[PDB]
Amino acid sequence: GVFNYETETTSVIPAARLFKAFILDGDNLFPKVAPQAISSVENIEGNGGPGTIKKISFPEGFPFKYVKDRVDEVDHTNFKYNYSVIEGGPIGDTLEKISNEIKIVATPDGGSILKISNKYHTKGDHEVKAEQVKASKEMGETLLRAVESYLLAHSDAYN
Numbered sequence: 001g002v003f004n005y006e007t008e009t010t011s012v013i014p015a016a017r018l019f020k021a022f023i024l025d026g027d028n029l030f031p032k033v034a035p036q037a038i039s040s041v042e043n044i045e046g047n048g049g050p051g052t053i054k055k056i057s058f059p060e061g062f063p064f065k066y067v068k069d070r071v072d073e074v075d076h077t078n079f080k081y082n083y084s085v086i087e088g089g090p091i092g093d094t095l096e097k098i099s100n101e102i103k104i105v106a107t108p109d110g111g112s113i114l115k116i117s118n119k120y121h122t123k124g125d126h127e128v129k130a131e132q133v134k135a136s137k138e139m140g141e142t143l144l145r146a147v148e149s150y151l152l153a154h155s156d157a158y159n
């Protein structure tokens with residue numbers, strides 16, 4: 001069945017620039033700006049569009065070794081990005097897929113708001129524990145702050 005989790009978090013970076021950096025150049029930026037969170041990102045198949053498969057590896061000592069994600073949808077106009085965790089880490093005999101949706105919305109002070117939905121597709125009924133979802137939020141949060149700091153510090157990057 002599906003468990004749906006939503007959250008919002010704010011960013012000090014405008015929506016277009018954050019979308020270009022955080023989403024469209026995430027494979028490059030995450031290993032560089034947050035090495036203690038994501039050790040590498042390998043493009044397995046595809047050009048960044050729908051269907052593209054990537055392998056996200058975590059640093060030594062993390063609960064999981066890696067996950068493989070698949071790009072579902074990329075909407076440059078509304079700054080929407082949908083992707084699914086399809087293999088590895090928690091994927092297995094109790095969790096079939098995590099389907100996530102990120103939308104980034106402009107705020108009038110020059111910042112942005114990121115609205116995130118995670119949908120955990122389980123086999124049988126194995127419930128998603130508060131820490132399966134809470135670990136996920138912290139990680140997303142850590143990556144966003146690390147990209148934010150880099151973009152503040154590198155004003156000519158991603159304009």
Ligand SMILES: C[C@H](CCC(=O)O)[C@H]1CC[C@H]2[C@@H]3CC[C@@H]4C[C@H](O)CC[C@]4(C)[C@H]3C[C@H](O)[C@]12C
Pocket residue numbers: 022023024025026027028030054056067069083085098100118136137139140143
């Ligand atoms: C934001 C990028 C998309 C851009 C890119 O691939 O460069 C995506 C692609 C894979 C994503 C990671 C996959 C596994 C995790 C799923 C969790 O529910 C949130 C934290 C993690 C660690 C995700 C954080 C972030 O959502 C990533 C890194």
Ligand SMILES: O=S(=O)(O)c1cccc2cccc(Nc3ccccc3)c12
Pocket residue numbers: 005006007008009100102114116118133134136137138139140141142144
């Ligand atoms: O919210 S953040 O940390 O900002 C976040 C930021 C950027 C990308 C994210 C991708 C997936 C999940 C997140 N958090 C999340 C939210 C609810 C449940 C599980 C994970 C992401």
Ligand code: NA
Pocket residue numbers: 003127128129130133
């Ligand atoms: Na839950």
